[PDB]
Design a protein around this ligand. Sequence first.
Ligand SMILES: Nc1ncnc2c1ncn2[C@@H]1O[C@H](CSCC[C@H](N)C(=O)O)[C@@H](O)[C@H]1O
Ligand SMILES: C[n+]1cc2c3c(ccc2c2ccc4cc5c(cc4c21)OCO5)OCO3
Ligand SMILES: [K+]
Ligand SMILES: [K+]
Ligand code: NA
Length: 352
Amino acid sequence: GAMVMINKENLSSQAKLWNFIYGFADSLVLKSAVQLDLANIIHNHGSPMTLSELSLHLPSQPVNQDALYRVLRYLVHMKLFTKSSIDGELRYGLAPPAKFLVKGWDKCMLGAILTITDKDFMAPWHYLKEGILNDGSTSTAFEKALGTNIWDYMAEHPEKNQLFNEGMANDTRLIMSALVKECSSMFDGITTIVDVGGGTGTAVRNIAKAFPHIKCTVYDLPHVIADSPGYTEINSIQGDMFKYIPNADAIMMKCILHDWDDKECIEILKRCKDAVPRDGGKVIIIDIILDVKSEHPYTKMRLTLDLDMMLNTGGKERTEEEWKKLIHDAGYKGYKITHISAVQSVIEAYPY
Ligand SMILES: Nc1ncnc2c1ncn2[C@@H]1O[C@H](CSCC[C@H](N)C(=O)O)[C@@H](O)[C@H]1O
Ligand SMILES: C[n+]1cc2c3c(ccc2c2ccc4cc5c(cc4c21)OCO5)OCO3
Ligand SMILES: [K+]
Ligand SMILES: [K+]
Ligand code: NA
């Protein structure tokens, strides 16, 4: 026979399923709160605001106040926003994690939120079954959903190119302080550095400002360098890192190697090794290290990014043992990991 239930089933376990089913509601309610700029209206106001007060400052008019109330009720329940009775009125304030929704500091996450929750950029996730049950197709889910591989897609869609680049610029802003303060000695002795796949230059503009002695270069594909500002003192070069890595004292790669399969990473890493001097040259990798055995605050999002790479780029997020095999296979002498209390860690890879 089958299981026969004879008493009340657990509500909490059913609610766990419902909450996972509706996970996307947290994503897309958060998207709307960002688009409405609620956190910044309140933060600029400097104290909790009534529904009416909030409405007057919203990005467009008119405002459906019943809808706004109901979205605020949901955001209160997420514990991003607060609601309380003050002097005879209901007033909406910010909870502590809403600080990341507030503009004007390095940990504001708004760019990354608008990129990741974009409708077209979410589409590949609908093709996850197809990533396992391939039917012999070797295309990424991104190509199944949007027509071609991610990099050529950005080349062909300027508005999406800009959205993607600004999400990565934001992710870079989140780490740059910890990188230039905690890892300052990594930049000792260096006179030149190339950020390979450096995006629209957030990382190099920050390194250049912190280390005015170092001649910095950003290097990426033409359509990304075309979405970047021009500065006289930083070199901007375009090209294909699979064919050319510029000789420099140090090469850096942030959120690059997680886009590629093992063979491709080894090829990239070998070319980076050949580009730096035997005397003090180093390759600085910034990417996730997946823990195998313990849970950390960013564990859940690092596993999420593992699937994101699987679907969107064809890459993966790697454990330390996997990083070790790759760096070994590329012919380096060894590596050193530095944690910077971020999603990614720093891995210095040292040639002979
Ligand atoms: N063949 C190639 N050569 C150079 N850059 C490449 C490339 N293929 C992809 N890229 C670049 O790799 C970057 C991956 S996203 C990471 C960007 C930046 N380093 C950051 O962390 O914010 C993109 O900017 C993409 O345009
Ligand atoms: C995870 N992702 C997937 C994307 C993606 C796209 C386009 C952009 C992105 C993206 C852009 C910025 C990001 C920034 C991030 C991040 C993830 C992303 C991110 O996690 C850490 O900070 O096409 C479908 O898939
Ligand atoms: K969707
Ligand atoms: K982890
Ligand atoms: Na139920």
